[PDB]
Amino acid sequence: SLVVFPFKHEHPEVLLHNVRVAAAHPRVHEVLCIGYERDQTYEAVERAAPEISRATGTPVSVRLQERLGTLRPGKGDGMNTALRYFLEETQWERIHFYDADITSFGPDWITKAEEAADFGYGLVRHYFPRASTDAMITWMITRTGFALLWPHTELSWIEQPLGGELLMRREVAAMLYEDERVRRRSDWGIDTLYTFVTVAAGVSIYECYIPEGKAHRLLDDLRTMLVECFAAIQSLQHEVVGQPAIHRQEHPHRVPVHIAERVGYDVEATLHRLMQHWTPRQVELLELFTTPVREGLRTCQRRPAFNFMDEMAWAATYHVLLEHFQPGDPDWEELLFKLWTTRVLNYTMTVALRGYDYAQQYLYRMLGRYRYQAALE
Ligand SMILES: [Cl-]
Ligand SMILES: [Mg+2]
Structure with missing residues (x-):
């Protein structure tokens, strides 16, 4: 071998x-x-x-x-x-x-x-085993995509597709x-x-x-990976x-304690990052999204906002992205980054902060809700 x-x-x-x-x-x-x-x-x-x-x-x-x-x-x-x-x-x-x-x-x-x-x-x-705020590309981009696009397949069941x-x-x-x-x-x-x-x-x-x-090497260091992983799903979106x-x-097994308690990304720097690298074009692009997401992401120009980016809103946003996102376009890339960042923050404050088990249960149930929703079409 x-x-x-x-x-x-x-x-x-x-x-x-x-x-x-x-x-x-x-x-x-x-x-x-x-x-x-x-x-x-x-x-x-x-x-x-x-x-x-x-x-x-x-x-x-x-x-x-x-x-x-x-x-x-x-x-x-x-x-x-x-x-x-x-x-x-x-x-x-x-x-x-x-x-x-x-x-x-x-x-x-x-x-x-x-x-x-x-x-x-x-x-x-x-x-x-992963910490509850690890693998947010995997969950929010990959598994979500697979769940929304191929709900009857084994795709969204793959634990770590990345x-x-x-x-x-x-x-x-x-x-x-x-x-x-x-x-x-x-x-x-x-x-x-x-x-x-x-x-x-x-x-x-x-x-x-x-x-x-x-154990290997340890939010915007992840930007290229985010876009490229989202591109991959987008490129497949018509496959059968x-x-x-x-x-x-x-x-x-039960997760080891030192992993469940692993530090995690920098919340403050993440919040701050939502207010940076704006351009008028990013702002015109939001016109493509639903009103709460549009208002939501716009507020981030003045102060961090993320309560709006719940499960349903993420799915809405995902669909708009599937149809309008262009890899290689710097404003689309930054916009995906902000959008995903808000989802992550939302998950962190409304779910992860409720505890390891809670967050895990939430993630699986999320995928299930996405699968059912997609199958109703
Ligand atoms: Cl990930
Ligand atoms: Mg690594």
């Missing part, structure tokens, strides 16, 4: 450790790191490779991501390049991906996925490398595409729970899903 770690700008020791771990695992045939560009991290790994290959008996290689897609050159190009390397330079049966920034990696992650594949699953997704930890069988990887929609997503949209396409193709999915968290998928979730 091949284990891939896509990396951009990571601390070498961090990644090297993970490579060590995967290299030492009895079911791993080869390790490939897939870099954005030849940098500090890249050279550090190119160098350590031999010492590690001798120690473990496992080939270890670094390669550069090639431009296989047509959006921003980002993580999608990396993953896809690894897909190509996997299929064209190796004859291994299964491929894993794990983020490079991870600091809680262990052999048991590899084991759990390998054993689930042995059981018969086509794709294995690792999911993790997660980069997974395992594919050779044929699944091949199908994905063949898909033009997949190939195109060179940017942060890659993960959404793997999720969408594997489910749409009727691959059988298992999600395994990693009880210890996912023509078959069911076997889909099963390892039962989750």
